[model samples]
Target: QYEDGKQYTTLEKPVAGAPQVLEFFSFFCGHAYQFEEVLHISDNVKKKLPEGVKMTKYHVNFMGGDLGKDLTQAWAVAMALGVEDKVTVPLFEGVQKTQTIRSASDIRDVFINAGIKGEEYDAAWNSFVVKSLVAQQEKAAADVQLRGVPAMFVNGKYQLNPQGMDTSNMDVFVQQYADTVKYLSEK
Candidate 1:
């Protein structure tokens, strides 16, 4: 959840008084793959995100496990180093649905169950992480059937994939988003 005054329920979208949809994703999984990269960007950009827009983080316990703890701490390190305006640390939340994940072993079942397609790397996802991922997706899906994870929807019509595991073109990645926000807010 967002801070008390800035909680999302107060408005229909993120970014106060802005029409363009700005969804703040608070992921709670245990994967640390792109964490270092995100840290690098925070160091480089140093408050580059446009004013009136922000990204909030949430640390979801990985099925009662805290594998993402280190990643969360990395974000805090960046903040303490005078980058608090650029990045937000995840809010720690304990296991909400404790009963279901009490004895959970892996994440594949939730992935397969959520209808997320199996990738070669899916086999590498830890069991507890998979459970957390599934719970995350199920919560998202229960609100509305989403087509994929790490997605962005614009203007209540256009949905775009904000992430790709194997990408070298960081400029294109950001430009696409910049262009979209420019386009959406113009109307």
Candidate 2:
């Protein structure tokens, strides 16, 4: 069983949906960058889940303040366009590492490099679907009283505490984390 206090906790307002392993993150946080880019924890956890289970992500708006909505849109569009690697990695590096994302076109340029034509990028960026997703991400995060980045949840209710893992070694932490995700998913 998962430890409620140490290993996991229930969401204050649990979101009921698909049998999913959900994660909340921001491009602004270095820890989030590590979780996705370096560790690929979500990727591994996706495979560990049962066949029907899904891996879902919400880009939390609370972290970036005024810049939040656009960043979330950028993420949503990249995901929709299936160019997450091309868009996300560069944006994260530009915003977090180099601090170089200066304009809206700079964001589109990343998509362009991904071989998505400019007009196509604009369509996805401004679409009704992404707009709804931007709002959904904002609300989902507020309901959880989320105060940090890289939060993890199973079935949209049970959250896995990152502190519960052995953080010193990369290999050990990855397996233990996935194992924990598997155990909690059965609930």
Candidate 3:
């Protein structure tokens, strides 16, 4: 349901001089857990980030994969977490794949879960499935008037991070993320 060229109905266009954005997430939350490996890898990227970067967090509002039902649940959790005031978890419709679901969900099911396990397909799937979802979450969250924790957007763009990056390769990861912030800051 994400449109490539069209902006999300609610998202604001980027503004000049916006602070740098950084997102911090964890494994307990569904989306955050999905990126555990890549994010851990980006810890190095954080160290190298230049000064004047702005950061935000978007923790999951609930504990499951049913977009519709879980979103409602997440909304409740969002309020309890005190993020409901800042971030908006939309009630969206999409083909969400989650291993926890018994139904043969789309690739989103096994694809995202397998990568999160840090298995063989971890790299490819994480880049494709995990990263894509993270981007989508960032965009949607940005579109909403509210913002939350564990999620950060540098300037206007969302930085890429997943749960499977090789920890040893962090230097490069951090460099890449910092470069992104530098570019955004310049704009």
Candidate 4:
């Protein structure tokens, strides 16, 4: 079994709420690009989670600019539009494979091609709800001391350790996270 402080760091105390896992990530981070591909909570891992345990992604703006801030906001917008399922993978693929997304319009074009209506895009992208969600994520990242992408937090309390893992191997990295999630959920 993994040991706390070595394999994970427990929050001075747990955050209020159900058991939840949050992945702090950035579209600009290559590791995040790879991890996003395997982020679907597989059945094997799903069965291992305790009832009420959940997982989510929190986009971080470490890159800090029009590119960074826009991508972060785009992710929140996609989530708000219920298009994150379609957008996440393509966004990563576009970023990692071709670096094709460079501006808000470029991202909007991706949404358009993904079947989002023009009005739907305008409604979601400019809505207060999407803006609020992005702000929440930004605050959560700072509260958790998130300085990097592709990092996992369990129950909003513990940050899993990535030491000794092969960052370059997606399978290995994901498996480690699955194991950590299982461990946290069972506790």
Best TM-score goes to which candidate? 2
**Model 2 bad stretches (over 4 Å):** 31-39, 62-65
lDDT of 1 by residue, 1-187 (tens): 1122221112233322221342323334324435434434433332444566443322222333443443233223332333333323222122122212222222223333334345522333334544553443335333333433343433443333444221357665455444544344333
TM-score of each: 0.34, 0.86, 0.35, 0.80
Ranking by TM-score: 2, 4, 3, 1
Task: Tell me, by lDDT, which candidate is best.
Answer: 2
After best superposition, candidate 1 residue 122: deviation in angstroms?
A: 37
* lDDT value for model 4: 0.72
| Worst 10 contiguous positions by lDDT, candidate 4 | 38-47
Q: After the best TM-score superposition of candidate 4, give how far the Cα of residue 105 lies from its true spot, in angstroms.
A: 1.0
User: What is the descending lDDT order?
Assistant: 2, 4, 3, 1
What digit string (tens of lDDT, one per residue) describes model 2 on residues 62-104? 6456566677888888767777756676777667666666577
Against the hidden true structure, what lDDT does model 1 obtain?
A: 0.35
User: What is the Å distance of residue 60 in model 4 from its true position?
Assistant: 1.2
Error of 4 at 182 (Å): 2.6
Clashing pairs in 1: 106-127, 107-127, 107-130, 107-131
